[PDB]
Curated annotation (Swiss-Prot), chain B:
It comes from Drosophila melanogaster (Fruit fly). Component of the GINS complex which is a heterotetramer of Sld5, Psf1, Psf2 and Psf3. This is Probable DNA replication complex GINS protein PSF2. The GINS complex plays an essential role in the initiation of DNA replication. Belongs to the GINS2/PSF2 family. It is found in: Nucleus. One of its GO terms (biological process) is regulation of DNA-templated transcription elongation. GO terms for cellular component: CMG complex; GINS complex; nucleus.
From Swiss-Prot, chain C:
The keyword Heme does not apply. It comes from the Eukaryota. SMART domains: MCM. GO terms for cellular component: CMG complex; cytosol; MCM complex; nucleus. It is found in: Nucleus; Cytoplasm, Cytosol. ADP binds at R302. The gene is Mcm5. This is DNA replication licensing factor Mcm5. Component of the Mcm2-7 complex. The complex forms a toroidal hexameric ring with the proposed subunit order Mcm2-Mcm6-Mcm4-Mcm7-Mcm3-Mcm5. It catalyses: ATP + H2O = ADP + phosphate + H(+).
Swiss-Prot record, chain D:
GO terms for molecular function: ATP binding; ATP hydrolysis activity; helicase activity; single-stranded DNA binding. Component of the Mcm2-7 complex. The complex forms a toroidal hexameric ring with the proposed subunit order Mcm2-Mcm6-Mcm4-Mcm7-Mcm3-Mcm5. GO terms for biological process: DNA strand elongation involved in DNA replication; double-strand break repair via break-induced replication; mitotic DNA replication initiation; premeiotic DNA replication. GO terms for cellular component: CMG complex; MCM complex; nucleus. Its main location: nucleus. This is DNA replication licensing factor Mcm3. It catalyses: ATP + H2O = ADP + phosphate + H(+).
Amino acid sequence: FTQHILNQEESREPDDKRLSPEETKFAQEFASNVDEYFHKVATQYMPNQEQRIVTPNLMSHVFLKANVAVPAVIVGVDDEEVDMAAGSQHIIPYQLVADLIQNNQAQLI
Amino acid sequence: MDPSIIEFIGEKCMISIIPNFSNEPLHLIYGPVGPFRAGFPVFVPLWMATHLRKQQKCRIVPPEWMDMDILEEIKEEEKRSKFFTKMPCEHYMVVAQLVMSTAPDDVPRCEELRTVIKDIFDIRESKLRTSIDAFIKGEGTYAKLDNLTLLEIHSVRPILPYSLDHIARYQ
Amino acid sequence: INLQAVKKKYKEFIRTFNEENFFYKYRDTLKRNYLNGRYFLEIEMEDLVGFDETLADKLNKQPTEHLEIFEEAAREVADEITAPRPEHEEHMHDIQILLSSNANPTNIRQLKSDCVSKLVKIAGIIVAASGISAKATRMSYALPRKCNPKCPLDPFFIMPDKCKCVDFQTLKLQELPDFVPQGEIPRHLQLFCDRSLCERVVPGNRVLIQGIYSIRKGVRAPYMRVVGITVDSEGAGAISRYSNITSDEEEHFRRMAASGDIYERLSQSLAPSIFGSRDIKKAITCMLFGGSRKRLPDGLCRRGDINVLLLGDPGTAKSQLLKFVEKVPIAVYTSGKGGLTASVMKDPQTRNFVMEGAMVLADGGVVCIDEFDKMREDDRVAIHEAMEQQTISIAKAGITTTLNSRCSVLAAANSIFGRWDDTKGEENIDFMPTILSRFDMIFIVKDIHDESRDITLAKHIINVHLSSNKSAPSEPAEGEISLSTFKKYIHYCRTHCGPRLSEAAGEKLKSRYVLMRSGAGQQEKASDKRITVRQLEAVIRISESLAKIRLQPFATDEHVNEALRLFQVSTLDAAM
Amino acid sequence: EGEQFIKDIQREYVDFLDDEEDQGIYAGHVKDMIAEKSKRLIVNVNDLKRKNPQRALGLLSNAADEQLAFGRALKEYASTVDPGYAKMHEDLFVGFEGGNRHVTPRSLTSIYLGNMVCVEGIVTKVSLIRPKVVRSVHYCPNTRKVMERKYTDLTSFEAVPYPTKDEDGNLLETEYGLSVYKDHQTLTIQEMPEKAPAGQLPRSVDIVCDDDLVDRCKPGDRVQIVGSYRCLPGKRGSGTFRTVLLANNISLLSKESNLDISREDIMLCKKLAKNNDIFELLSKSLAPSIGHVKQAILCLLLGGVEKILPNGTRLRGDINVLLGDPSAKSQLLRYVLNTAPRAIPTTGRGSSGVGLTAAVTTDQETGERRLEAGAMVLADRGVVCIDEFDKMSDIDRTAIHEVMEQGRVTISKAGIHASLNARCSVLAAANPVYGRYDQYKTPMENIGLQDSLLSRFDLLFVMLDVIDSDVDQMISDHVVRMHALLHGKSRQRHEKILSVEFMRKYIHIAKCMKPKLGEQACEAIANEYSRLRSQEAVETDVARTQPITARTLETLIRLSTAHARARMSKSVTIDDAHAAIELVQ
Amino acid sequence: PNYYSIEDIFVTQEKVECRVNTKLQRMGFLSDDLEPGRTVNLPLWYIKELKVNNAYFTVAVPDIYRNVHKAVCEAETTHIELGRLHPYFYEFGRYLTPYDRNHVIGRIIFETLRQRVRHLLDISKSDGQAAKAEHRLDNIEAKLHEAGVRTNSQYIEWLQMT
Amino acid sequence: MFGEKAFDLLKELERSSQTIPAFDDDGVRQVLEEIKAIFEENVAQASSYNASGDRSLWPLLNFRHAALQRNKRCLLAYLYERCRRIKALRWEFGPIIPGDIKQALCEPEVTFFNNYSKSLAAYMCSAGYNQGLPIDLTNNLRPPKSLYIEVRCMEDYGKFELDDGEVIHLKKNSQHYLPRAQVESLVRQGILHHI
Ligand SMILES: Nc1ncnc2c1ncn2[C@@H]1O[C@H](COP(=O)(O)OP(=O)(O)OP(=O)(O)O)[C@@H](O)[C@H]1O
Ligand SMILES: Nc1ncnc2c1ncn2[C@@H]1O[C@H](COP(=O)(O)OP(=O)(O)OP(=O)(O)O)[C@@H](O)[C@H]1O
């Protein structure tokens, strides 16, 4: 995911929440290196004039563990997230829920 | 997902045994451990009974959910369990293997338990396919965990979803 | 008793099979058969001794009942595991069992009254067997009198909407050729097979068998069936259609393939007792491998395999070589005296004109013969035809079922007066050229003199012919070993690859054949007195065979310089 | 009336009758309102699954009486829609017509019992016919009440069933006329065998049929069928088991009328007919995989032309030819077996049934006395090929003389005088006595058979192979070309204007016309035959000019006729003369 | 520039049987002028971004892709058999769907692969030796096929210390 | 072939699983002699009056675009799988025992290789300790025991053990003055499934 991680980090460069600095050290090291290795392919005729992305997808179905109210604690998520529980799960994807986990309300396995 | 990765999870669980020593050249490690003196129980995790029983130091005994009778009535509860059944510690498919591997030099009834635990294992596993022969319409807000365990569910995890998302996108 | 068996023993037997490593069961095997529609299971006969010490000694005496107590135990132990919950046993289903052993094989000559209704083990050979009619279990033998105003004396209407159906095949067995047929001919026997083992044995194979010798009606009749067949390992006694080869075998195989010292290794493979004759031998092995049977949108199903020739003075070991080529996937051998007709006979039952059909029996195998010479021409024309189109036709009575068979062919010969013809001109064959033309190889044999060769062929043979020598020192040579490997290896290599040429091979081959035909025509004109598509369409098959060897699909003409320098032997042989 | 669900099933097949799709189309103007009266309605299972899946796959799992319920519902419907044609008071079986499970005759294997499924195989054993016994409107003059009694058997439905002295001893005049009858039939199928493993014998099946479906092809064609399974008799309750098939509509898979032939495809044909130099194309069409004939082999593929007189006699219209040392003559005949209809190779070594029968029977179920078939009537109105001719015996040759030349087969097998209509042509292959030879010794006597046949055939001819040192590189060029799409667009072509399928589809009209002779063939043919018999026997060719007769006329007219069919010019010209005759010279 | 995978470019190559509506110029890889109607094969890359409403080429489907088989195989979605005459058959519409003008194909595709949500009841094991059912395959279902075989083959190794 | 060969490009490493004899720099030479044969046409008509500004040239743009796509991404594979497998064995050892050859370094790969080595340098610096304790992480997993003895193994070559012994002959019978810091590299490269 060395491609558009950088877009969020230039959105704010978050604090200790999102990333750590040495990873950014690595990221710029690698992003420079691939180009200076591409050196000996096409750099006397490198491109003359967006589309290269790697890890964008946010719908890989995961398994949730709820940890909360045995009734349906309804929270910020797009679907009918009804029937939340204390020991149970109704499966969902990750786009609609990157919210509970940042609350540490819910868990994965 | 591995045969041992989840033992770096599951093997941390606790049992209670009796060692044969006094306190060791060091008596106790600063932590939840209790003091070491022969002839009496002590409560431990499971990354030592491996190390201990074959180090020819002590005995070992199991928890209570390992028996015949409880694991002969839980199955007939499971038969009508249209959803799920009773769950003794929820990663009990691995403590059994790491117990019945070494321990049986002294443990009682070290086969018929294997019989019943597999007899529950298979029935619940075959249950966990028939979710799929009814799972319709991309229903990715409705599914089952209610008294499920973990050591079965890695036996599905990389097959279905990794493709299910980018496939049943259409609905 | 009927139930104390199923009550606990068989029912818990499968449940109880336990070695840690958590494999040692027949439960998981049963389920992984079930999932894929197979409906069978295998066992040994000396594992029950690992469970008890009596039941086996009861299994031998009353097998026919025990082998149904098994089926009941099998399904009542398996449908519990069918149940995911009570909602996916759509309906139960029946199974058949297999048992095996390694005890000892017997011979047909001891199948007598005492060995009746009793388990056995034998080892024989097959000729042919029937088709697949039917048989079933129940529906809605004596069908007694009572009826169930009157309804008289056995009015029973079968309800075959409500009947059932299993299989029926009637296999066969002939003996082996080393158990006193010497002052006799070989007898044989007919058999019986039940549910899932039709299309398990084609005729022309070596068998192990587990069976039982039981009757149907004091001169009453014999028969036998399968009680859990298995097969033979005469090197690879039965490795002819299926695959219990494993990734280990594929690994060893393909690791042999890339080993680029295998072909010159294999030019010394056939004879651990014969000296010399290596250029003769570099393409007796490719004949097995075969090339490509490339059909096209038009008609041209062009000739797949290749064909062999040899004629020479005796004293150069022709016979042993051809017997060895028979020995090492499937093939048969006659020589002369046999056909031009095929088999339109008549079963005296029903009086029809059935077609019994034996170039049929090499449809993936091959055939070898000696003496095309000393068998006259009334039976050469059907074989004129077969080996160019393989559409073996029939037009005798009111049937025109031009069936077909893909076979190759190997030819030994004997010319009159030795090399008398072979020095001078046109007495190479005495008969005709269009079966000398319609072949590929052209390899003559001579026995010329030289004292060094004389003395060497002297001592080379003595150490061979002294006291059954080769126990120790044959395999200790480099790589000249294990025909069994060759059998299984071929039955891989022929049945995978679909090779064909490159670009660069085509022009070089065309120019080379051009020079060949031009040299022949110049020999015509440089003597003031006197080149088929077959020669090109055959020599291409040696490139086909070589690429088959190394498993590369595409092959080069520099790879094939060996092949064309083999064909050079033919060219400079028929030099005149 | 058995289990009560049967009537739910009746109304559930009525539940097909909702709205426009079946309540509008499938019932009404369907057979009797359109007045074809072919009782069998056309069913398609897919719509059934699309309406009633429990009643769709209930059928392809069981057929106890669902057919009968279909028929009951159909009569209940048509009795309302149009009772005038409701006077056929019988079962009125229907389609079940329409790849769920299409196993071979080799694999009708111990399951599918109680199912309705698909088979393929050979049209074979086109066999004997009989009628069937149904029900009869009996009568008694003493009492004058026309009673009734229906008769069954298992091959019609489940159950199993003449009256004399019925009530107490009164009269019984069994009244026919109002007693009815179906038509009945029995024959078999064989696996189209070339899917065989020739280490095994292709297996067989058994099929039975019924009334309005009877005897719908000739044995020697390819076919599809879709039918159900039944198995009656004893099986150690008394001795083992047997099979039979029913419940089907017929499907032949080698026709042209199967094609939706409107007035447009004929329009393309007749448009392109104006193109003149198409003969050289169609010659280069037949054998795209091989030098070398086929300009005329085409005419052999056009049958011929039949010419009769008032109440006199008739002639045979077709052509037969052949010419060569070994190495592309025994690979140019499989352009017939699987290019064009009714093509049957024969052996070169097969006796006793090229036209013989042997008439053998052995106590048939009925009284089958004596008959079998042959290998020419199979090829009526078409063609035959053979390989390895000269090695054939000198036994059956004279049968070839007769049935070729006389154009009728009027034979007897020692029991019965026989006559039929077989009007076909034939080929074979060729081999000289001594291998590679036709030129230095003589052209003739290198063949070695009677000089009567070249009258029966048409052509004394020649075929060889080699070249000198200049053109040898040219044959190298062509051989390397044989050994893509480039420069066969220098060959201005398309894979639809030159192909197999459209090429086949130019059969119908070229064989439906009758391109009569004008007059201007006459003086040409006469002067040319004059020159032919005069000076064909000089300048190195005296002995190769023996077999001329007055038979080159019927061949010439066959030829110009055929060539007049390949463009449908309902007339005949001098250009047709040249294109027809240049072969002979 | 794609949803990559190890099948990086088995992606935009699938050839079709597109028709012609009006004229073009200078076909290049195959006249700066042509007729209205001449059938021609075409790849998928350059056609990927030429404006479904715009009409150089026409409403155009292949014959296996033509609605007849595809309809009777959303009714024969029980044993529609594949082989290798069209090995991949699982995300073709994941470009090609909207270009019909008769909106048919997406529902077909989804039902077919919803049958794999119904199908792989059985494929749960490697019972023995090498290869079992290795030619009814799209080579995206082959991925998860090998994957499930792996997970079971290692889960086996779990089943004891084995 | 027209964009197929990368599956052929890794085939130098077809046998090189864990019994590897050696490795090479295959499949770049004629293949990037391509790219200077084609740029001529790819930028031939740039804003040209060659066609007077007309729509027809759109296949050419996408031709260039897809050509770049295939070329660059096969390059990413020939880079990344090499680095990744080498990264596996480079987790099985530091630059203590580098590759079998160091002759198949596709020349610019010095930067690539050594940068990843400095990936692990950063790893060591921050992880292990804040100052950086290079944290023994994937080899030499003996519980605390003796420091200096030798033992038996199974015939490895490459012979790069520069660590703290005079000459130890790192194969079967590398059986000589071996300290702990000498033998600090091996757990799995094909060596000590058997002491
Ligand atoms: N070149 C050889 N090297 C070693 N042994 C040989 C050789 N040639 C022949 N022999 C011995 O002689 C026997 C082979 O004779 P073979 O049966 O081939 O003669 P043949 O070819 O059948 O003669 P003919 O063709 O006239 O029947 C073998 O049993 C072998 O022991
Ligand atoms: N011009 C050609 N067209 C088609 N096939 C050719 C041509 N030239 C050579 N061949 C091939 O060469 C082989 C020639 O053998 P062919 O079948 O003609 O023998 P044959 O004429 O049947 O022999 P015989 O007449 O003695 O039975 C065939 O496989 C054929 O495909």
